Ligand binder design. Structure first.
Ligand SMILES: Nc1nc2c(ncn2[C@@H]2O[C@H](COP(=O)(O)OP(=O)(O)O)[C@@H](O)[C@H]2O)c(=O)[nH]1
Length: 403
């Protein structure tokens, strides 16, 4: 069932590798010309795809395929022509893997290929079919995060999670009632003529034809939605306040690496009370600090509009992709301020940094010794980055590898 797309500028072995992991399909059940299932022998199954200036491939590809293999040529390196393909493929929420043709994993030791910014290279000799098992290992994993429900990439998916009676049902409509908004297990609406989807909106429709089973099945119901949403809205109870489950479902988002927002509903029904309740939230949600605290009301529409904007802001950042050149200026700037730690002689060195993921954005820092980068410096960098391009709404992770 999964769908994989080899992409890259022409004359890089795209056509070679395809035959490696190729029989064709014709008049059999499908959601599509020129589709193939995986080379039957192979460990796993999925569909391959022929995509038919390369902008046409790149879009048609990321229209119809949930894991994309972008393939350069390492005979003579990261071509000018290549960097524009990457630039096209930066506009996708789907995974991407980096095939580097004709190399020894040795000839692979090139920071240039990391720059392109889709993570680690995976070298592949093509004629001998070396280094390929690792590639399909790096691809297949993503099959485990492909949702069985799919939308156009320009659709934006989100959810209103929390404990019961807090506002979830009331508050969804108040938004839909606004004139900017224009009205299937989910609600598929538009705002400013742009598609939107509140994921599992039967979190409302089910609970009122059905006596409330128990905490377990509803939370699970919610965490399953979170797996499909890009922005979560953790929507509290303004009278009642903090607890277990709010935190529990809200902690899963950060641990899923999800764009979070903190809505405080039933604020009409509240009599300094903000900033004491804010730092009360920031105490008990001291990981969610990037995410903004909204003090709206569903019942009286108070600040109801302070919402879809904040989502778009969070959704925009969750995707937001930084230039490798600027980023390193920021990082070189980091150390000149605060020198790296001493481990009595052995000091940490930061050679080179680069973006690799999004949803949520993720950076690798290349160093002399990974464990020498203690978490303290790791966050210092994180805090520096956020004072540069904001990223206010989203989590970001910072891995680190030996050069
Ligand atoms: N009087 C009163 N009304 C409540 C109480 N709890 C909930 N409600 C009402 O029921 C609604 C519950 O909100 P809802 O959006 O359904 O939250 P959800 O059930 O978690 O989606 C509120 O807007 C309140 O008017 C309560 O303790 N007292």
């Amino acid at each position: 069932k999964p769908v994989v797309a080899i992409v890259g500028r022409p004359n890089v072995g795209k056509s070679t590798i395809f035959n490696r992991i190729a029989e064709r399909i014709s008049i059999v059940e499908d959601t599509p010309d020129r589709i193939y299932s995986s080379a039957e022998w192979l460990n796993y199954d999925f569909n391959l795809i022929d995509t038919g200036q390369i902008r046409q491939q790149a879009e048609i590809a990321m229209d119809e395929a949930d894991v994309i293999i972008f393939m350069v040529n390492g005979r003579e390196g990261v071509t000018a022509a290549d960097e524009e393909v990457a630039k096209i493929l930066y506009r996708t929420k789907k995974p991407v893997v980096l095939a580097v043709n004709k190399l020894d994993n040795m000839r692979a030791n090139i920071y240039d290929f990391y720059s392109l910014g889709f993570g680690e290279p995976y070298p592949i000799s093509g004629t001998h079919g070396l280094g390929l098992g690792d590639l399909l290992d790096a691809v297949a994993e993503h099959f485990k995060n492909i949702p069985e429900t799919k939308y156009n990439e320009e659709v934006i998916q989100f959810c209103l999670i929390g404990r019961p009676n807090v506002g979830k049902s009331s508050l969804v409509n108040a938004m839909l009632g606004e004139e900017r908004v224009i009205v299937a297990v989910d609600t598929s609406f538009t705002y400013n003529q742009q598609e939107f989807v509140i994921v599992d909106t039967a979190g409302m429709r089910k609970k009122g034809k059905v006596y409330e089973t128990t905490e377990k099945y509803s939370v699970l119901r919610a965490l399953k939605a979170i797996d499909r949403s890009e922005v979560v809205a953790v929507v509290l109870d303004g009278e009642e306040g903090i607890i277990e489950q709010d935190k529990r479902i809200a902690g899963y988002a950060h641990e899923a690496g999800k764009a979070v927002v903190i809505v405080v509903n039933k604020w009409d029904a509240v009599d300094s009370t903000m900033k004491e309740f804010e730092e009360n939230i920031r105490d008990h949600f001291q990981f969610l600090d990037y995410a903004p605290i909204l003090f709206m009301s569903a019942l009286t529409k108070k600040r109801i509009h302070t919402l879809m904007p904040a989502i778009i802001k969070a959704s925009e950042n969750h995707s937001l992709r930084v230039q490798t050149n600027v980023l390193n200026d920021v990082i070189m700037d980091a150390v000149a301020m605060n020198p790296t730690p001493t481990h009595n002689g052995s000091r940490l060195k930061i050679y080179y940094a680069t973006q690799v993921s999004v949803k949520p954005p993720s950076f690798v820092v290349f160093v002399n010794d990974p464990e020498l980068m203690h978490f303290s410096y790791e966050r210092f960098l994180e805090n520096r980055i956020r004072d540069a391009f904001g990223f206010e709404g989203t989590p970001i992770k910072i891995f680190a590898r030996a050069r």
